Design a protein around this ligand. Structure first.
Ligand SMILES: [Ca+2]
Ligand SMILES: [Ca+2]
Ligand SMILES: [Ca+2]
Ligand SMILES: [Ca+2]
Ligand SMILES: [Ca+2]
Ligand SMILES: [Ca+2]
Ligand SMILES: [Ca+2]
Ligand SMILES: [Ca+2]
Ligand SMILES: [Ca+2]
Ligand SMILES: [Ca+2]
Ligand SMILES: [Ca+2]
Ligand SMILES: [Ca+2]
Ligand SMILES: [Ca+2]
Ligand SMILES: [N+]
Ligand SMILES: [N+]
Length: 388
RNA sequence: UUUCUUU
RNA sequence: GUUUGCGCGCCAUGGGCGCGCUCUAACGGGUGUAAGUCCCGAACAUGCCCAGGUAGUGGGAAAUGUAUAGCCGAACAGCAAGGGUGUCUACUGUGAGGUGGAAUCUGAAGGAAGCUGUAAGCGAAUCUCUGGUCCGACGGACAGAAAUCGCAUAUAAGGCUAGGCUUCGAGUGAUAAGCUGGCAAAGAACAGUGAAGUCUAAUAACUACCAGUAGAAGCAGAGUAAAUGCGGCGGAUAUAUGGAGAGAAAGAGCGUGCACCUUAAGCGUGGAGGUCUCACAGAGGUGCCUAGUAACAACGAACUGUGAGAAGUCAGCCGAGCCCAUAGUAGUGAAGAAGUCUCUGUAAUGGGGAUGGAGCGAAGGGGCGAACAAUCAAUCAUGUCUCGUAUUGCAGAAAUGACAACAUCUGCCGUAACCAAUCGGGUAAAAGGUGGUCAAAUCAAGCGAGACGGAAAGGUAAGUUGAUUGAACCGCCGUAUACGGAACCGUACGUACGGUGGUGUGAGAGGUCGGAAUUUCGAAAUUCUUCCUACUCGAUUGAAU
């Protein structure tokens, strides 16, 4: 019919195929490729369109098969309209042109607006817990084409459609929390509410947990769902703090996120990797660019100084270990600039790698400037350029 | 900072 | 690829068992039949202490040295026969090449059984007790294996480095195997600590000069890993292991023997296979040429025999056995070979004994290849779907009802003179506004869920036989045999033989020009890739590409 032809338009299906090419995904439960998807749509696209129009297509069984990924992408690219008009302004997750940094900025705006007390709410394992009939009556309450309802229900009995389904079922919660008058910031199944006082935050936690367990039919993980103050608040990788200058709360990378970055950096700058130090520096540059590009709305200037010093120190160990022989270490320390009468003495401390790379002649030869010329982007100046 | 040797 | 790494023979300057001769505790003394042993005497300089913070004089407790016969000779020097070099050369050859010199590297951890001088170290039967270390394979520690047990261990257990906090709190110290020094492993140096016992616990301070604490227990972290750590049992312990206690106890040097044993860079000798050169006849190309491009392959005429020559081998990884040639030759064997019989041993390789009367028997490089390990191929009712009938899970609208009582969000109270636990309470804390709430007879959208039914149709391999791949490496253990450096870690897994796990295909170039495509007719060009090559690099303890 009309909306189902809007699903199965030629430009829409070509856009879905190009988008699933850009995703570069893997095989499903049977085993095929995206170029195999291309020859599949070349030979068998009309049968797929006929089965979708005639309500006979059956899904396949985590990762979906790539023809189901393509069909789900088509359904997502038609259904991100009117739903996206209907969604809330504070639903900052799995939507076009919205990202996590906007969620953290909105949370900081509401936190500085006077609402300190946080109702963190943890919805446990959403996509299996939800009742299918309620979700399909929501979908039928916005759209009235039976065939798209049929294929989405067959998919829920069995992707890029599941984030949109999560946004529908939690858009019900957002409409309720706009009806009550609550301020909130909600990434996809990560919702935090902002209350003025702590017992009112307990009451809001109790009432919203009652509403979620009764009306949405979801399960609230009461072990992790807690009432806080914006200091023990982990949200989207960001922790929050209060400046002594009594004007603003501010975001920062939480200690779990800093620990994840430090673990990844220690894996990239491991001393015994057989790759060249240019490869370690390039992987470090990719990780540093990604970490700062996610977190740059926080304040980590001291943290970026410390992490830059630690990255440089581990790179001094990698370069000193790759030299691997005291004659070669003495030759390279003379070549980099350290005088031979001292370079031989440091090089015949060939072991004690952390001790010699901590300070001294190896600090002077492999300086900050030599590593900066080597291609190691500093965390501090990259954060300075990429901040406000 | 071992003005050393080897796997 | 690699300094060398092969076979056979010889030789001890190594070792064993005996004999002799001469020594043995600074220098001396005693005990005693006998002292090398048991015991007692003197200084001297060091170490440590008299601190109070070091540097000098006066002193004091342990310990060491001069100072046992002697051994050993550094990761210490010097000499150094020999060995290598796309290096420069003088001669010599028709040439492959061979010499003799210079330069430089090397002279090695496995036989010039290299030489000389040292620092440092060591230096006495046997027994008992004890500390430390090491071993009882390897394998992130499983499996497999002939292989000590149990637990823990990659977020990184564990160690270590630099701090922090909280409680203690200076004062005995020597002797020193070992441990640790921010981690792949081991050794050496230096530094700090330091188990076990044992010995000490004594002295007395000035002349210049410089201004609780030191230190450990405990706790949370931070940083740092090519992974082992802890405990039990058993064993080793001549780096003459740190000691302690008995011990009238042996230790060392030299010479000499043995029908004694053994050795990888010493001496003599042997090098096939392949590679290369030259000459003589053929085969060709133009009387003269035969190769080149690392080999393979290909261009071209550059191919063959035969004979004389030259350099030269010698690296476990899936290989029992066989073939080519040096070669049944050197060598070995009458001091007893092969065969035969009989005691025995190992996980496997073995070792005696008795007959016997002549055998056994190499080197390097290719080829075939049983077997092993993977991989591959060949052989050998439900459930639809189509009509139903009774239901059903979830929306929504509203005739009527009942009770006004529920849902919801801004959450403080007295104080003090003004305190958010900053004062006492309390977290559905009081005062509050906002929407009234619930049941819906019935009708009803859409996707499903399933029941009762009539109805379309439906329901071998194991084994064995082949073929391909297993290129290169990492080790480890038993016996024999040598070294650095006893142990550990190494010497190509040290090497030879015998066991045993693990990783699985570096780059360029050349070829195969197979495989894939784009262009033209699977054939030509191009790009990536499979297969072959120690030519050129890349390593070297692995691993990595
Ligand atoms: Ca080696
Ligand atoms: Ca001496
Ligand atoms: Ca061992
Ligand atoms: Ca091990
Ligand atoms: Ca640790
Ligand atoms: Ca001693
Ligand atoms: Ca030698
Ligand atoms: Ca010759
Ligand atoms: Ca092999
Ligand atoms: Ca190697
Ligand atoms: Ca070893
Ligand atoms: Ca090796
Ligand atoms: Ca060698
Ligand atoms: N070699
Ligand atoms: N090896």
């Amino acid at each position: 019919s009309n909306l189902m032809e809007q699903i199965l338009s030629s430009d829409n299906l070509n856009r879905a195929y190009l988008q699933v090419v850009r995703n570069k995904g893997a095989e499903g439960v049977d085993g095929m490729k995206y170029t195999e998807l291309k020859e599949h749509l070349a030979k068998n696209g009309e049968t797929i369109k006929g089965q979708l129009r005639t309500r006979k297509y059956k899904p396949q069984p985590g990762v979906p098969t790539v023809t189901d990924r393509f069909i789900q992408q088509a359904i997502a690219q038609v259904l991100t309209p009117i739903y996206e008009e209907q969604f809330h302004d504070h639903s900052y997750g799995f939507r076009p042109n919205r990202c996590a940094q906007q969620a953290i900025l909105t949370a900081l705006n509401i936190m500085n607006d006077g609402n300190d007390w946080i109702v963190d709410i943890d919805l446990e394992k959403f996509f299996d817990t939800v009742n299918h009939d309620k979700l399909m009556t929501l979908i039928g309450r916005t759209i009235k084409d039976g065939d798209v309802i049929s294929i989405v229900r067959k998919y829920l009995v069995s992707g890029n459609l599941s984030p949109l389904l999560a946004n529908i079922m939690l858009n019900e919660l957002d409409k309720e929390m706009e009806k009550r008058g609550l301020n909130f910031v909600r990434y996809a199944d990560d919702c935090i509410i902002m209350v003025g006082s702590e017992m009112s935050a307990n009451r809001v936690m109790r009432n919203i947990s009652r509403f979620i367990e009764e009306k949405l039919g979801l399960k609230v993980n009461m072990t992790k769902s807690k009432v806080d103050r914006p200091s023990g608040l982990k949200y989207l990788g960001f922790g929050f703090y209060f400046d002594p200058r009594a004007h603003q709360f501010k975001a920062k990378p939480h200690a779990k996120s800093v620990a994840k970055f430090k673990k990844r950096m220690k894996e990239l700058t491991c001393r015994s990797w057989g790759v060249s130090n240019s490869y370690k520096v390039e992987k470090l540059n990719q990780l540093i660019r990604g970490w700062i590009n996610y977190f740059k709305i926080g304040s980590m200037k001291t943290l970026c100084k410390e992490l830059d010093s630690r990255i440089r120190y581990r790179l001094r160990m990698c370069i000193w270990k790759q030299w691997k022989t005291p004659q070669n270490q003495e030759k390279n320390l003379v070549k980099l600039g350290i005088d031979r009468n001292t370079a031989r003495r440091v090089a015949y401390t060939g072991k004690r790698i952390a001790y010699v790379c901590n300070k001294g002649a190896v600090n002077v030869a492999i300086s900050n400037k030599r590593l900066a010329s080597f291609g190691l982007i500093s965390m501090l100046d990259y954060y300075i350029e990429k901040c406000v």
